[PDB]
Symmetry: D2
Subunit: 395 residues, 4 copies
C-alpha cells in the first residue's frame, strides 16, 4: 500500500439518519445522496464541485430509484455532467467499498478528485410483482417486499438476517441479556454524543419544504431507548428461546454519507488541508449465514494492508448490524468495548444499508477528533458472507 | 498506464444472448452469470476456480434478484465462499466498468486472480408497486415496469433512451434509411459470423433440463430475425411520422451474461498460464445525459491515450449498438470506417442484455481479433445518463 | 291490481350506523355489517324466531373479495338457518330497495312466508384489481384498478364518473353551486337535528368492536362534519372553475347495512305479529344512463300508480341524495316541496353505502312517518346505469 | 297466478379457460346471448323487453351492473329494468325464477333472464392498498378462488367439498372417471349430430390488422377427452387417496345463456309461439359443505311446486359441478342415468358458473325436442349449501 500514491480525505458529511417511514421518508435515495455530497464539498476550502471527476456511490435496494442512483446523486448535488458515476452494491458494505474503489481510482492515476459514499431510502423501497410479463393463470400470487428480498434475506438459506444473528449468538455464546446490555450501552453513548453536540459537525441538517418548513437535525432512533421495554420485549425471530430483538438489532433506516478524496499532487496544487489519510483496507468473506463475523477477517486484513498493528488503533467502528455482531467480533479479535463505537452504533443510530459503510467512517473521523485519537479502523459486515474494513489516520 | 502493473486476460466466455421472454427467459440473472463465469474459468489451463479472489459483476435491473447479484453469480459458479463480490451499475456500461475495476484491483495489489463481467435477465425484471407501505386511499394506481424505470429512462428528462436516439439522428443528420441500411449490414455480419462458427468458441451453450425433453440453447436468438422488407416498412418506434429510430434498427431487450478472467503478471508466471490478451488501458467519460449516444467519442480517445495507442493502430473496434444511430454517430465523430467496426455484428443484431453488454462486446472483440488476425482492439459502450466506458486490449 | 295478490307486511327494520370511508366501521366486512342489521331487525319482532326466516335477498354492489354469495354470508352470520334461501342483488345504488321488492314478490307468488331483505356495503374494504395477471402484460406500466371507481361510481357506457353526470344534471335543470350548497347545509341540519333529538335511536343498531372494554359506534359518522364556511369555499370536484358539484354537496363513500323483515298476511295473524307497515306498491324505471339522476321522476309515479295512491296523499318522501342536485332536480320535475322530503336528512349528510342505501332510506322513512305522525310514505333511489327504484309504504 | 312462457332461448359456445372466448367480457357474451334469443321470436321486437335479470358471480372489474351492460349491449331499450343476481353456481337459474315471478306479479310482460360468466377475465385483488402494509410480503387474491370456488366458512376449494360428497355416498375414482367418459361421449355425439346447433349462437371474432377472422361455433371442452390420459392422471385435491381430478370435474369456462319469457296475455296479444311453459321451481339449502347434494332437496321441491311427480319427467339436467355430484344426486333421488344430461354435462361441456343455470335450461329444451319428451327438469347446486331446480313442459 505504501508503494502507491497517497489518498487524502479532505471532508465528509452525512444526513441525519431517519427512521423507517419517519422523518426523511419523503426523500428519495438520490436526494439524500446529493445532500450529503453537496455538504461534504462545501467544507473543502479551495476545492470546487466542478473539480470532482468521478463518483462511486453505494445503494442496495435500487428498485424504482431510476437509472444509475450514483449519477442522480452526483447531478443532484451540482456536479458537472462530465463526472464519471458508478453505483456499487455489496449490500451493507456498499458505502465503504465505494470509498475503496474511489481510493483505488486515484491510486491508478485515473482521477485526482473523487466523491464516494452511499445512500439508502428503505422507506421508499417498493414491493415487486414478479410474474406479470408471462402471467400466472390461476392461484393467489405474492407481492415481494423489496427490503426483505434484496436487502435482508440470505439468498442461499432464504432466511432473514435476524436468523443469521441467532446463529451468531449460538456460535459465539451470547445470551439475550448480554445482547440487551450491549444495546443499552450503545444507545447511552449515542444519546450522550447527541446531547454534547458531537454529531453537529458531521451531520448536514435537512430542510423539508413546508404548513411551514421542517428542519431535521438529529438522528431519529437514539431517543427511542426505553431500557425497561427493551429488557421485557419478546424475541423477534425465535419464539421463547430467541435472543435477538428489534430493540437489540439495527432498525430499517434512511440516510446518506459522503467523503471527498484527493491525490497528493492535487492536494498540493490546490493548497488543500487534509482531514485524514487512508492507510489501507481489506475485504474478506466466508459462509453466507456467517456474514456476522466476517469483520474478524476483514479487519486484520485491513490492518496488515495499512501496515498498522491492532493495538495501535485508537478507535474502531464495528457496524452494529445486531448487538450480537459487535459482541462476537470484539470477542474474536480481542478488542475491548472501550475502543469500539465511542459515539454509539447502528443499533442506536440506524442502519440505512447502502450508506452505513460511509456513515461509520464519517462518525469515526468525529470520534478520533473528539477523543484525540490518530488511528481508526472501520469494519462492516454484509449480507452474503462479506465484510469490508478501512484504516484511516487523522491528521 | 505503462508504469502500472500488467493485467492479463487469460480467458472469457458468454452465454448465448436470448430474446426478451425467449430462449433463456426461465433463467435468473445470477444463473446466467454463474454459467458464464464457470465456462470462462474452465478454459484456463492450470488455474482453478478456487484461485479466484475477487469478483466485480455488472447488473442494472437488480430488483427481485436477491442480495448482491455478483455474489450469487460467484457462488453459483462454484467459487469459494472466501471470494470478494461486488455488483456494479453504470447502466449499459456496467459490464465494462466491472472489468475496469477488476483490473484496478489487481493493479493496486489487492488481488492476483479476478473474475469480472456482467449479467442481465431483462425477461425477469419485475413490476413495482411503489406506495403500498403508506397506502393509497382512493384512485387507480400504477404498476411500474422496472425495465423502463431502472433500465431505459433517463432519470433527468424522464424520457426513454429511444427518444434521445432520435435527438442523435437530428443532431448528426442520420436518416431513417441510413439507420436501416446500417442495421441490415450488422445483421448480415452477425449471421455470417454465426454461420461460419465464429461465435462457437466464445459462447458456452446452455442446457435447460426438462421438467419433458431437455433443451440446449446454442446460438444467439436475435440474428435470424432479420427481414429486410419488414425492417424497411415498419413504423417509427418513438416519433410518429417523422421518426427514424425503429425497433428493428435499435437493440432489443435480451438476457445474457459474459465474464473474463484476469490475472497479475506474478500469478501468470507462477501458474505458467497462457494469456489471451493484455489490457492496455481504459477510459470513462460523460457529457449531457440526453447526449449519452456520443459519449463514446470522448471515452474512446481517452482509453487510447491511457493505452499509449493511436486510433489508427487499432485493428478492430466494438462500438456497442445501443441504436444503429449510435454506431453511425460515433463512427462519424471519430473518423472510424465501418469496415473496422463490429466485424461480427453488433447488439442491434445480437441483442443487448444491458448489464452484460460491456463484457459481452469485449468477449466478441477477442474473437474478432483472433479470426481476423488482429492485434489491437478497442471496446466502447455508451450508457444512459450521459456516460461511456472504453477499453483497449492487445491480443497476445 | 295489487289486490289480486297476497299482502306483504313490514314487521321490523334496523340499520347499522353509517361509517365514513376508512372510518369508524372500516374494520368490519360487508357480511358482518349485514349480519348485524339482520340480527337486529329480527330481535324487534315479538313472536317471531330467526329460524322462521325462509329466504333472504340482500343488495351488495362492490362484491370483489367478499367471498361466495354475500347475502348467504349475511344470513348465516346473523344466525339464520342453513336451510335459508339466499341471493345477492346488484342494481348498483338501488340494490337495497330492489332486494326488498324481490322479497315482497317471493311472498306474493307464495314461495315464502318470512323473508329478510335489505343491503350492505363496505366501501372501505373494496379492493384494487389487477386485471391482466392471468395472460400477462409483456412490457409497459400497468394499472391497479380501484374497485370503487370501476364497479361503483363509473357509468359503463361513457366511462364517466357519476359526479360528472351530476354536473350534467345541474346544467339540465338549472341548479347552481349556491343552490346545491344551500340544500346540502339544510339536509345536514335536518340530519343533525334528528341526531340531537334521538330520532335515529330506534332504527340504529349500535355496533360493538371487541377491544379490555369494547368500543361502541352509535351515531352516523358524517353528519357532524358539517362546516358551512369550508363547504361554500371548497373548490368543485369534477369541473375546475365552472363546476357546481362538490365533495361536500355530494354523498360520501360509506360503510353500513340495513334490513327489513317481511311476512305474509297469513303468518302475521298465525303467530299474531304487530305490523309496522304494509307495502302498497313499487316501481322500477330507467332511462338514458347519463340521466340516471332524474330516473326517480319516472320510478316514483310508477310506484304511486302501482300503489293506487296520489302524490299529494304522501306524507313523507325519501329521495336518496346521491348528490344534492339529484334531490333538487327530482323535486323540481315532480312538484314535491322540500318540506316533505328527507325530513331527518339524506345521504349527503348521513352517508351512501351504496348497496345498503335503498334499504337504509326505507328504514329512516318508517322513523320519519312515526315522528311526524304520517301514514303514507314513498322512497325513491336512483342508480348508476340510468335506473331507479321506488316503494310506497303505509304505516300501520 | 298467470302462466309464464319461454318463447326462445340461446347460449354462446362455452369457451375454455383463457380459451376461445377469453377476449370477450362477461357483458359481451351476455349481450350476444340476449340478442340471439330475441332474434328467434318473430312477432316480438327487442324493444318489447321490459326487464332483465342476469346472473353473474365474479363481477369484479366487469363494471356497473353487469346485467345492465348485457341488456344495453344486446340492443334493449334504455327504459329496461336490469338487475344482476348472484346465487353462485345457481345464479342463472335464480335469475329466471325472478323473471317468472316478475311476470306473475304483473310488473312485466316480456322479461329476459339468464346468466353470464367470463372466468378468463376475473381479476386478482390487492385488498390492503388503502390502509397500506408497512413491511412484509403481501398477497394478490385470485378472484375465482375467492368469490367463486371457495366455501366461505370452511375456506376450502369446491374440489374438497367434492371429495366429501364422494366419501359420503360411496363413489370411487373409477366410478367418477367412467361417468366423466360417459358424459364426454354424450357431448361428442351431439356435436357430431348437430343437436347443439339450434341452441348455440356462434360468435364472430373479426381480425382486421391483417389477421383472419375467427368464428367460434363449438363448445371447446368436449373434444379434449383422452381416456388413456383421463384414467391415469393424479388426483387434484387429495394426493394418493383422492377421487376428484380435473378431467372428471367441471372446468373453468366462459359463456352466457338467455331465455325470453312472456306473460299469458302477451303470448296471445302478439300471436307468439311458445317453446315451453314454466310449471314450477324450488330453492333449497343445507350445510354449506354439503352443497353437492342440495339438488336432492331442490328437485323434489320444484316437482311439488309444479304438481309433477318424479316418474313423469322425460329428461333431467343435473349440473355436473363434479362427476360425483351428478352420481350422488342420482343415488339420492333414485334417477337412472339414461334420462340425465342426454347431450352431455358441465364436466364435458364447461361450467361458466354465473351462466350454467341458464345454460342447462337451454340444453334441456334441446334434449326434450330431440328425445320428443314433454316434462323436463333442471337442477343446479351452488356454493354456500344451496341449489335451485326448475320444471318445464315443452309445447
Ligand atoms: Cl458477500
Ligand atoms: Cl453516466
Ligand atoms: Cl340501470
Ligand atoms: Cl347457498
Ligand atoms: Cs468549497
Ligand atoms: Cs485552499
Ligand atoms: Cs455541520
Ligand atoms: Cs434498535
Ligand atoms: Cs492505541
Ligand atoms: Cs481449469
Ligand atoms: Cs465453447
Ligand atoms: Cs433489432
Ligand atoms: Cs491497424
Ligand atoms: Cs324475536
Ligand atoms: Cs335500537
Ligand atoms: Cs358530503
Ligand atoms: Cs324478432
Ligand atoms: Cs342457431
Ligand atoms: Cs373436465
Amino acid at each position: 500500500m505504501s508503494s502507491l500514491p497517497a489518498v487524502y480525505i479532505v471532508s465528509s458529511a452525512r444526513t441525519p439518519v431517519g427512521s423507517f417511514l419517519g422523518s426523511l421518508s419523503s426523500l428519495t435515495a438520490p436526494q439524500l445522496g446529493a445532500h450529503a455530497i453537496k455538504a461534504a464539498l462545501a467544507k473543502v476550502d479551495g476545492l470546487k464541485p466542478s473539480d470532482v471527476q468521478e463518483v462511486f456511490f453505494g445503494n442496495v435496494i435500487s428498485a424504482n430509484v431510476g437509472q444509475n442512483p450514483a449519477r442522480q446523486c452526483a447531478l443532484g448535488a451540482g456536479l458537472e455532467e462530465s463526472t464519471i458515476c458508478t453505483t456499487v452494491n455489496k449490500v451493507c458494505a456498499s458505502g465503504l467499498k465505494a470509498i475503496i474503489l474511489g481510493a483505488q481510482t486515484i491510486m491508478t492515476g485515473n482521477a485526482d478528485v473523487v466523491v464516494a459514499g452511499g445512500t439508502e431510502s428503505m422507506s421508499n423501497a417498493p414491493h415487486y410483482l414478479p410474474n406479470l410479463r408471462t402471467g400466472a393463470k390461476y392461484g393467489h400470487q405474492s407481492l415481494v417486499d423489496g427490503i426483505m428480498k434484496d436487502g435482508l434475506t440470505d439468498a442461499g438459506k432464504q432466511e432473514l438476517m435476524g436468523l443469521q444473528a441467532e446463529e451468531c449468538a449460538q456460535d459465539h455464546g451470547f445470551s439475550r441479556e448480554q445482547q440487551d446490555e450491549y444495546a443499552i450501552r450503545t444507545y447511552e453513548k449515542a444519546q450522550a454524543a447527541q446531547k454534547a453536540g458531537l454529531f453537529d459537525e458531521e451531520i448536514a441538517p435537512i430542510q423539508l419544504p413546508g404548513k411551514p418548513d421542517v428542519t431535521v437535525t438529529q438522528d431519529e432512533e437514539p431517543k427511542n431507548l426505553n431500557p425497561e421495554k427493551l429488557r421485557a420485549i419478546k424475541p423477534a425471530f425465535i419464539p421463547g428461546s430467541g435472543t435477538v430483538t428489534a430493540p437489540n438489532s439495527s432498525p430499517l433506516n434512511d440516510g446518506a454519507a459522503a467523503v471527498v478524496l484527493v491525490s497528493e499532487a492535487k492536494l498540493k496544487e490546490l493548497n488543500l488541508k487534509p482531514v485524514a489519510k487512508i492507510l489501507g483496507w481489506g475485504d474478506a468473506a466466508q459462509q453466507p449465514s456467517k456474514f456476522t463475523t466476517a469483520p474478524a477477517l476483514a479487519i486484520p486484513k485491513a490492518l496488515k494492508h495499512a501496515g498498522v498493528g491492532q493495538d495501535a488503533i485508537d478507535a474502531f467502528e464495528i457496524n452494529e448490524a445486531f448487538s450480537v455482531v459487535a459482541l462476537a467480533n470484539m470477542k474474536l479479535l480481542g478488542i475491548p468495548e472501550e475502543k469500539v463505537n465511542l459515539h454509539g452504533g447502528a443499533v442506536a443510530i440506524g442502519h440505512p444499508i447502502g450508506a452505513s459503510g460511509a456513515r461509520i467512517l464519517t462518525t469515526l473521523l468525529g470520534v478520533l477528533k473528539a477523543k484525540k485519537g490518530k488511528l481508526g479502523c472501520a469494519g462492516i459486515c454484509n449480507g452474503g458472507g462479506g465484510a469490508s474494513a478501512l484504516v484511516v489516520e487523522l491528521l
